[PDB]
């Protein structure tokens, strides 16, 4: 309600100009004495392990059977190609698993923009150079598989058998499902109608691209609303 003059006639002017899915300048005003560091540290506490995401789990390559072979028509090795596929960020709206179609022959540096566009898959970095291709029918094809997880679980306890039934040629890859990369906060002051000693907590947020920052901070906001009903009941 309106109540007395502490914070009740003090609106929080928190507004939006969006950069697509990877970084956002988050602004905040006004909050009173000593309210910057607990904000940055509590949503550094939540936004590192409590956030699910969709990362790279297990990649199938062509006739190259394991990670340390060679392919006729490529300069780099398959280990550096898969290393370039580890850093590839992908967004999946509402699918549990999806297989990404990729094929390109001839000369030309294949980037992430050559991936066949799906209705629920959007590439955040089309400029990511993976490997350099040459002549003499250098046909490369991959099947990128995306699964849901949260945070880091190692590749020795999860161990998965997609193609470990009789046709083989897959092996499990380390997965970093954690979306939130960096949050940096500035602690300048603000002023509104009620009181003067009020802190403006401007945030530089950085996300890899697996989960959008709006949906992630809304999920972390309702998780926070689920948190502080702890002091409620008796016994």
């Amino acid at each position: 309600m309106q109540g007395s003059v502490t914070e009740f006639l003090k609106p929080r002017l928190v507004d939006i100009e969006q950069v697509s899915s990877t970084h956002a300048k988050v602004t905040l005003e006004p909050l009173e004495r000593g309210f910057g560091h607990t904000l940055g540290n509590a949503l550094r506490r939540i936004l590192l392990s409590s956030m699910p995401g969709c990362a790279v789990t297990e990649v199938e390559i062509d006739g190259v059977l394991h990670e340390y072979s060679t392919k006729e028509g490529v300069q780099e090795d398959i280990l550096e190609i898969l290393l370039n596929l580890k850093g590839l960020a992908v967004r999946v709206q509402g699918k549990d698993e999806v297989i990404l179609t990729l094929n390109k022959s001839g000369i030309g540096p294949v980037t992430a923009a050559d991936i066949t566009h799906d209705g629920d898959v959007e590439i955040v970095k089309p400029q990511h150079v993976i490997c350099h291709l040459t002549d003499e029918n250098a046909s490369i094809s991959m099947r990128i598989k995306v699964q849901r997880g949260r945070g880091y679980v190692p590749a020795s306890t999860r161990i998965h058998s997609e193609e470990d039934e009789r046709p083989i040629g897959r092996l499990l890859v380390d997965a970093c499902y954690s979306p939130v990369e960096r949050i940096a906060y500035n602690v300048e002051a603000a002023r509104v109608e009620q009181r003067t000693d009020l802190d403006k907590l401007v945030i530089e947020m950085e996300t890899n691209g697996t989960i959008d920052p709006e949906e992630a901070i809304r999920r972390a906001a309702t998780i926070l609303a689920e948190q502080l009903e702890a002091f409620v009941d008796l016994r």
């Binding site: 550094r44 506490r45 945070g151 954690s178 990369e181 960096r182 940096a184 500035n186 950085e206």
Partner: protein, 48 residues
Amino acid sequence: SGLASLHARVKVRITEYEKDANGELVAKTSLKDTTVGRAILWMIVPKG
């Protein structure tokens, strides 16, 4: 390769990451302790 050895622990000579950003992510989940304040001191003051 020092995290399983006696040369490096969770407060002695260890850093295994590319940049500054997720080094504090790894440090918060009890895997790293040092060179994170040296990593965040190198970007808090020269950002403004």
